[PDB]
C-alpha cells in the first residue's frame, strides 16, 4: 500500500541460515525472506547462493512500497553476508550505507562449551 522510498535492510547471516528483513528508517519491517524458505535445506540453505536468492526474493516482496535506497545491516559470521548484498544491489536498489551490526561482548556471558566432534 504505502510508499517509503527509503529503507534499511537487515541481514542476519548465520552459519545455518540467512534472513533478509527489510524495514523502514524507524525499524518497522516492510518484508522479509529466508534461504530455507526458498527451496533449500541443510547444505544449500547454508550457502551464499541461497542467501542471494533470499535477498532478491525479499526485494520482490517489498515491491509494493517503492523503496529505492537502502542502508545495509549485516549481522553474523555466515557466508550469506556479501552475496545477499550483491543480490539487493543488482535487484535495483540504490545502496547508500553499509554497517556491520554483529554483537561483540566486551568481556560478557560465558559461551557454550567446545564441541568434541
Amino acid at each position: 500500500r504505502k510508499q517509503v522510498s527509503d529503507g534499511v535492510a537487515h541481514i542476519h547471516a548465520s552459519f545455518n541460515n540467512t534472513i533478509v528483513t527489510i524495514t523502514d528508517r524507524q525499524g518497522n519491517a516492510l518484508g522479509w525472506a529466508t534461504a530455507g524458505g526458498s527451496g533449500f535445506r541443510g547444505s544449500r540453505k547454508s550457502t551464499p547462493f541461497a542467501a542471494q536468492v533470499a535477498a532478491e526474493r525479499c526485494a520482490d516482496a517489498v515491491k509494493e512500497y517503492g523503496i529505492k535506497n537502502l542502508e545495509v545491516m549485516v549481522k553474523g559470521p555466515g557466508p550469506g553476508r556479501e552475496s545477499t548484498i550483491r543480490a539487493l544491489n543488482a535487484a535495483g536498489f540504490r545502496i547508500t550505507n553499509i554497517t556491520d551490526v554483529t554483537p561483540i561482548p566486551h568481556x560478557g556471558c560465558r559461551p557454550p562449551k567446545k564441541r568434541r566432534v
Binding site: T99, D100, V101, I104, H106
Partner: protein
C-alpha cells in the same frame, strides 16, 4: 613507529587531550596495538588508562556503533 610521548617527554597522557588520544584509538573506537604504533610500554599503559577514563566521561565512544 617512533614512540611520541618520549620524544616530547610528556609526564602523563592526560585523557583530556582527546585529539592526542584520537590518534591512538581506532575509528571504530578501539585502542590500537602498541606494536602497530611503536609507543613504549609505560606510555601505552598510560594511553589505555586515559582512553578508558575519557570513555567513562563520554568524550570518546566505546565503539563506532553505539
Amino acid at each position: 613507529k617512533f614512540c611520541r610521548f618520549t620524544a616530547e617527554g610528556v609526564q602523563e597522557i592526560d585523557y583530556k587531550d582527546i585529539a592526542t588520544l584520537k590518534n591512538y584509538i581506532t575509528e571504530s573506537g578501539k585502542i590500537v596495538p602498541s606494536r602497530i604504533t611503536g609507543t613504549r610500554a609505560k606510555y601505552q599503559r598510560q594511553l589505555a588508562r586515559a582512553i578508558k577514563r575519557a570513555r567513562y566521561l563520554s568524550l570518546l565512544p566505546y565503539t563506532d556503533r553505539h
